[PDB]
Design a protein around this ligand. Structure first.
Ligand SMILES: [Mg+2]
Ligand SMILES: [Mg+2]
Ligand SMILES: [Mg+2]
Ligand SMILES: [Mg+2]
Ligand SMILES: [Mg+2]
Ligand SMILES: [Mg+2]
Ligand SMILES: [Mg+2]
Ligand SMILES: [Mg+2]
Ligand SMILES: [Mg+2]
Lengths: 151, 99, 100, 114, 79, 206, 127
RNA sequence: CGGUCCGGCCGGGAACUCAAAGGAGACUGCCAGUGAUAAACUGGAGGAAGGUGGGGAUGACGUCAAGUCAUCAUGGCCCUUACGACCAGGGCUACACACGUGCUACAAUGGCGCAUACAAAGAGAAGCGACCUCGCGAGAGCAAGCGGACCUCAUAAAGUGCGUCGUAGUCCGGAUUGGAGUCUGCAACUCGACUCCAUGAAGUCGGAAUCGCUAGUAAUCGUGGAUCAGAAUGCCACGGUG
C-alpha cells in the first residue's frame, strides 16, 4: 500500500435476504473457511433475536449495530521519539466493519451454550447498549476525547 | 482381426512424426486406420537438492514426459503388414504390437 | 564412499542371488505353511547358518559412480548431485527443468 | 447406584456411567449392556434393582477396581525384581517403552526443576 | 513383539545350553547372543551376556523365560 | 549469484540431448550406468583425438554411439583399423551389439568442449593463462562467433591465493532461451592444484 | 435440436442442454435438491434464470464432473448462460452486467519449494 | 437413436466432457479524463482474459578468505604387520537442563454413533494386489486383473441429514504404563510400525517477547509421492471449502 493504490473487493450478497452488510458479517464470524456452518450460526442467532425482540430481522440487526458503530478513533504516530495518539474520523465502510467485528469477538468471549445463543444475546445487549461490544466503542471514545488537542 | 500399435517416446515432435509415417504407410497400402489417438502423458516429476552440503530450500525440479500414441489398423492386408514391418522408425520411439 | 564399502556391496549382491533367491526363499515359505510341519522343521535354525550378507534387506542402495549411500533415486541409480550433473549435460533422456 | 468396586455411578447414560469403574472402558461397557439385555442410551432412573444386580454379575467376570490395581502393580514389581531393562526404568522414573530423554519426557519424569 | 510362529534362539547358544545340561553346570557361558528368547531349559544356568565391552553374568530364573538375554545386561553407563 | 547451466536450461528449446534413447523404470538405471561406462572408455582412449560430444541412442536391443570429433582421421584409423577395436569393446561394456558413427567438427575453435580442453591442455604445458584465454577468444571471434566468454578459476600461475579471471568479447545473452549458447567445462590438473575452465559461445538467435 | 453451452470453474466441468417447456433440473440423473445439500449452491444455478425470465419456460439436462460443491455449482452457472446465448445471442448484454459470461480463472496455486503451502512460509527465527 | 439383466452395458454415434499435438488471442489497440499536446496513470467499452491477466522457470558485476577436502575430483601434509582391512555385540536413540522448528490439544464453528453428496494429482511385476473366506482388529489363507485414460493401491475428508452429550478437567484431550497380539526382516532387549483390551498425565487458550500471509492467498479438510525389507507429526506434490 506504499505505491499501489488499491480499491475494495465487492463480495456477493446474502443468500437469504440479499444484504451485502450481512455477507460481510458471516465472513467475519466464519472460521477455518467454513461458510456453510458460519451462515448457519448467523441465521439461527437472527431467528432467535428477531423472535425475542419483535420481528424485523434486518432492522433488529441495524438497532444493535447503531450502538456499537464508532465515530472517532486514535492513530499511533511517533513524531519525536514519543508516540502521539492522533484522533481521526473513521470512514462509513470501516464504521460498520469495526461494529460487526466487536459483536463477533464479544460473543466469542461469552459463556453461553452455543454460538447461535452467544451471538443472539450479544446482539440483544447491543440493541439496549449494555455489553462487552458497546464498551469497546466506549473505550475508543474515551481515548479520542482525551487526545483531542493533537487533532 | 485388428492390429494395435502403442507408441512411447519422451519427445513429442518425434512421436507424432513417427506416428504420421505409420498412419500414411497403412492408409496408402489400403487399410482402415483408426486414430492417431492421443493418450495421457505420464509426467514423472523429480526434486533433487542443488547443494552438496546443507541448504534445504534450494532445489532443482525436473520431469520426464512419457507421451502416448495409439494407432489401430482394422484391415490386416498382406500389402499393409509387410509395408509396416519394413519401416525405419525413430530409435527413441518404442513400438508395442498388440494382436 | 570407501573402496572397501563399495566392495562390501558387491559381496552383498553376489550372496543375495546365490542363497536368498533360489534356496532361502524355499525355507521361508516352508516356515509359513500352516498345513505341513507345525513343530519339527529346523528351517528357522538352518536360515541362521546361511551367511548374513546373503539377505536382500542387508543391501544398501548406493550412487552407481561415487558410492554415496544417501540421496539415492532408483530411476537413475545415482545420487541427487550426480543426477543434476548428468541432467544438465543432457545425459538423462527426456529429463529437463520442469515448471507448472 | 452402586456397582462392584464400591463406586457410586452418577445419573448419566448407562454406557458412560459404567466407564466410572477402573477396568471398564468404552468396549467393556458396550459388551456388558449387550449381555445383560439393557439399552445404552437409558439413564439410572427407571433402572430397578432387578436390572442393577444382573450388570453386577456381568462385570464380576473381569478383574476390576482394587483387584485390577494390585494386578497391574504386581507386574510392575515383577519387572523390578527381575533386573530387566523394563524394570530398571520403572525404578528410575523414566520412559520404559523407548521414548527420547534428551527432551520431552515430562509425563514420567514429572515437572522440571533448575 | 514377534510372530507366535516360533520363538527365536541362536543355534550356537542353543547347542551351548544342551552341552551344559548333560555335562553339568560349568563357569559363566560367554555369549554375545542378546536377541535369543529364554527357554525353560535355561533356568539355573549362568549366561555371560555381552553389553558392548564386558560379559554380564546373569543367573537364569523361571520368571526370566520369554524375555530376551539383553534385558539383563545394561548397554549404557549412566551416573 | 549462482547461474543455471546454459546447456541444461536450453534442453528442449534450442539445445539437444546427449542421450536420445527411451526406457522404462526397469532398465533406465542399467542403461544410464552403461552410458557413463561407454563415455568413460572413449574419453580416456580418444583423449588426444579431440572428442567434443558423445551421443548415445538405443535402437531396440543395440547401441548407436555418435562420436563428434575435430580429428576423425585418428578416430577412424587405417581403413577402419581403430573403429573396429573401439566397437568390439563398446559391445562388451553395453552387452548389446555396437555401431559407432563419426561426426566431423568443422570449426573446432567454435566448440565449447574443444575450446575448454585446449585451455586445459595448454595450462598443463605451463602456458600463461591470460595468453591461453586471449587466443581462445580471438580465434572464436575471427571465425564468426557472435560472442565468447572464457573463465579460469583457482591458483592461477601457481599463486597461493586463488582467483577467478574472465575475458569476454561480443554479445553473450545468457537470459535469452532462443539464443544458441554452447557451454562446456574442463579441468586442468596442474602441479599446484585443479584449475576449472568455463567457456560460453553465442552463435546467434533462434 | 438441443441448445448447448459448456461451463467450468476450478477443476469442475459442466455440460448444459436447453429444451423449451417446464422448469425441470436433472443433474447426473438426479434432482437439483437431491445432489446439492446447500441452498446457497442451489441459488447460484437459479441466478441465470432471474435476469432472463423462466418459471416453466424451458428445461435443462445438466451433467458435471470434477471439483466440489461450489465448483460444480459455479460451473453449471457458466454453462446455462452459454446455452442461453446459443438460443438468442441478444441476452449477452444482461449476462455481462451480472458477470456470468466470465470464466473464473482462479485456480489453486501450486505448493512451492521451501514454503509450507502455496504462499505460507515456515516460521522465522533470529536466534 | 435401436435393445434391455436398467450397469454406457451392447450395436452404434463422432455431438459433447476429456485426452494432446498444431494454431488464434491482449498490443494501452479503441474511447474519455488527468498529465509539459510526452511518457504514464485512472475509468469505461468489447472480451474467456486488461494494463508484466494468474503461477512458475530464469538470479547481472559483485559482497560475506560465507557453506561443502564426509558426494565426487584434487596441490600439500600425515598413517601404511596401521589412521588400512574383516567380524560379533554395542553406540549414533544416553538425560540435571536450555533454545529452535513442528504435531496434537484445551472443546459445542466441538466430541461420538448411524446415514450420505462432491475431488485433484500420483505410484505399480523381486510390484500394485481386487473378489471370496477367517479374525472385534492389525492382519492371514485362497486367488482375478494389470507393466496399466482398461486393473489395483482407494471408502476422499471437511460438508450435509438425524439422534445424543449440555459448559463438567466433561461422552473434551490424548500422554504415560500394565496385559495380549499382528507384520516386515537371519534377527524388533537396547531401538520398528500397527492393532485389541484396560489406564485416562499435563492442558479450561499461554508472561516479556515474536512469526507467516494481500486472493482462490490466509485459515482449515482430506489425497498421493520420493527415500524405503520395515520405519513420516518431516519434506515434496495435489485438490475441497474458503
Ligand atoms: Mg575413493
Ligand atoms: Mg536399507
Ligand atoms: Mg475408565
Ligand atoms: Mg495449446
Ligand atoms: Mg527475464
Ligand atoms: Mg571460513
Ligand atoms: Mg565451517
Ligand atoms: Mg475421546
Ligand atoms: Mg506480495
Amino acid at each position: 500500500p506504499r505505491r499501489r493504490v488499491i480499491g475494495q473487493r465487492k463480495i456477493l450478497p446474502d443468500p437469504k435476504f440479499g444484504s451485502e452488510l450481512l455477507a460481510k458479517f458471516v465472513n467475519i464470524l466464519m472460521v477455518d473457511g467454513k461458510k456453510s456452518t458460519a451462515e448457519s450460526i448467523v441465521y439461527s442467532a437472527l431467528e432467535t433475536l428477531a423472535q425475542r425482540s419483535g420481528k424485523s430481522e434486518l432492522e433488529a440487526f441495524e438497532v444493535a449495530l447503531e450502538n456499537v458503530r464508532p465515530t472517532v478513533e486514535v492513530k499511533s504516530r511517533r513524531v519525536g521519539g514519543s508516540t502521539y495518539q492522533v484522533p481521526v474520523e473513521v470512514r462509513p465502510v470501516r464504521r460498520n466493519a469495526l461494529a460487526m467485528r466487536w459483536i463477533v469477538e464479544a460473543a466469542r468471549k461469552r459463556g453461553d451454550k452455543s454460538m447461535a445463543l452467544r451471538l443472539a444475546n450479544e446482539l440483544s445487549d447491543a440493541a439496549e447498549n449494555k455489553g462487552t461490544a458497546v464498551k469497546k466503542r466506549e473505550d475508543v471514545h474515551r481515548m479520542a476525547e482525551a487526545n483531542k488537542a493533537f487533532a | 482381426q485388428r492390429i494395435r500399435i502403442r507408441l512411447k517416446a519422451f519427445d513429442h515432435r518425434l512421436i507424432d512424426q513417427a506416428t504420421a509415417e505409420i498412419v500414411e504407410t497403412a492408409k496408402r497400402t489400403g487399410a482402415q486406420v483408426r486414430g492417431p489417438i492421443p493418450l495421457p502423458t505420464r509426467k514423472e516429476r523429480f526434486t533433487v537438492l542443488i547443494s552438496p552440503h546443507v541448504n534445504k530450500d534450494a532445489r532443482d525440479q525436473y520431469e520426464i514426459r512419457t507421451h502416448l500414441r495409439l494407432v489401430d489398423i482394422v484391415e490386416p492386408t498382406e500389402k499393409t503388414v509387410d509395408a509396416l514391418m519394413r519401416l525405419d522408425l525413430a530409435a527413441g520411439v518404442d513400438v508395442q504390437i498388440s494382436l | 564412499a570407501k573402496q572397501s564399502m563399495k566392495a562390501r556391496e558387491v559381496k552383498r549382491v553376489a550372496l543375495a542371488d546365490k542363497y536368498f533367491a533360489k534356496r532361502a526363499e524355499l525355507k521361508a515359505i516352508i516356515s509359513d505353511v500352516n498345513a505341513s510341519d507345525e513343530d519339527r522343521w529346523n528351517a528357522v535354525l538352518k536360515l541362521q547358518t546361511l551367511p548374513r550378507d546373503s539377505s536382500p534387506s542387508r543391501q544398501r542402495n548406493r550412487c552407481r559412480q561415487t558410492g554415496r549411500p544417501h540421496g539415492f533415486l532408483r530411476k537413475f541409480g545415482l545420487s541427487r548431485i550426480k543426477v543434476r550433473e548428468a541432467a544438465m549435460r543432457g545425459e538423462i533422456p527426456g529429463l529437463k527443468k520442469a515448471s507448472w | 447406584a452402586r456397582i462392584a468396586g464400591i463406586n457410586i455411578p452418577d445419573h448419566k447414560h448407562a454406557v458412560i456411567a459404567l466407564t466410572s469403574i477402573y477396568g471398564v472402558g468404552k468396549t467393556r461397557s458396550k459388551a456388558i449392556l449387550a449381555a445383560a439385555g439393557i439399552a445404552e442410551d437409558v439413564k439410572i432412573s427407571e433402572l430397578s434393582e432387578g436390572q442393577i444386580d444382573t450388570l453386577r454379575d456381568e462385570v464380576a467376570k473381569f478383574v476390576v477396581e482394587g483387584d485390577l490395581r494390585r494386578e497391574i502393580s504386581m507386574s510392575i514389581k515383577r519387572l523390578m525384581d527381575l533386573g530387566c531393562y523394563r524394570g530398571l526404568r520403572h525404578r528410575r522414573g523414566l520412559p520404559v517403552r523407548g521414548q527420547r530423554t534428551k527432551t520431552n519426557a515430562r509425563t514420567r519424569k514429572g515437572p522440571r526443576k533448575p | 513383539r514377534s510372530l507366535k510362529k516360533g520363538p527365536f534362539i541362536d543355534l550356537h547358544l542353543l547347542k551351548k545350553v544342551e552341552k551344559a545340561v548333560e555335562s553339568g553346570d560349568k563357569k559363566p557361558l560367554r555369549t554375545w547372543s542378546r536377541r535369543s528368547t529364554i527357554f525353560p531349559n535355561m533356568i539355573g544356568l549362568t549366561i555371560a551376556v555381552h553389553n558392548g565391552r564386558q560379559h554380564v553374568p546373569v543367573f537364569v530364573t523361571d520368571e526370566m523365560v520369554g524375555h530376551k538375554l539383553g534385558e539383563f545386561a545394561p548397554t549404557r553407563t549412566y551416573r | 549469484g549462482q547461474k543455471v547451466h546454459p546447456n541444461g536450461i536450453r534442453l528442449g528449446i534450442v539445445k539437444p540431448w546427449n542421450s536420445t534413447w527411451f526406457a522404462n523404470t526397469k532398465e533406465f538405471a542399467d542403461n544410464l550406468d552403461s552410458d557413463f561406462k561407454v563415455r568413460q572408455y572413449l574419453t580416456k582412449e580418444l583423449a588426444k583425438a579431440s572428442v567434443s560430444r558423445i551421443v548415445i541412442e538405443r535402437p531396440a536391443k543395440s547401441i548407436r554411439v555418435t562420436i563428434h570429433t575435430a580429428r576423425p582421421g585418428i578416430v577412424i584409423g587405417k581403413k577402419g583399423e581403430d573403429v573396429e577395436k573401439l566397437r568390439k569393446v563398446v559391445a562388451d561394456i553395453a552387452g548389446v551389439p555396437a555401431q559407432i558413427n563419426i561426426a566431423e567438427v568443422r570449426k573446432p575453435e567454435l566448440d565449447a568442449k574443444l575450446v575448454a580442453d585446449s585451455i586445459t591442455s595448454q595450462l598443463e604445458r605451463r602456458v600463461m593463462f591470460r595468453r591461453a584465454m586471449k587466443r581462445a577468444v580471438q580465434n572464436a571471434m575471427r571465425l564468426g562467433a557472435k560472442g565468447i566468454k572464457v573463465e579460469v578459476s583457482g591458483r592461477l600461475g601457481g599463486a597461493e591465493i586463488a582467483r577467478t579471471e574472465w575475458y569476454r568479447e561480443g554479445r553473450v545473452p545468457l537470459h535469452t532461451l532462443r539464443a544458441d549458447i554452447d557451454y562446456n567445462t574442463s579441468e586442468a590438473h596442474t602441479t599446484y592444484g585443479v584449475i576449472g575452465v568455463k567457456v560460453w559461445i553465442f552463435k546467434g538467435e533462434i | 435440436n438441443q441448445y448447448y453451452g459448456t461451463g467450468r470453474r476450478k477443476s469442475s466441468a459442466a455440460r448444459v442442454f436447453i429444451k423449451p417447456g417446464n422448469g425441470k433440473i436433472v443433474i447426473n440423473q438426479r434432482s437439483l435438491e437431491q445432489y446439492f445439500g446447500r441452498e446457497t449452491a442451489r441459488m447460484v444455478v437459479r441466478q441465470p434464470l432471474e435476469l432472463v425470465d423462466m418459471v416453466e419456460k424451458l428445461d435443462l439436462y445438466i451433467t458435471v464432473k470434477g471439483g466440489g460443491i461450489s465448483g460444480q455449482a459455479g460451473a453449471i452457472r457458466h454453462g446455462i448462460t452459454r446455452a442461453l446465448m446459443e438460443y438468442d445471442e441478444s441476452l449477452r448484454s444482461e449476462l455481462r452486467k451480472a458477470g456470468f459470461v466470465t470464466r473464473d480463472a482462479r485456480q489453486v496455486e501450486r505448493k512451492k519449494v521451501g514454503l509450507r503451502k502455496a504462499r505460507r512460509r515456515p516460521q522465522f527465527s533470529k536466534r
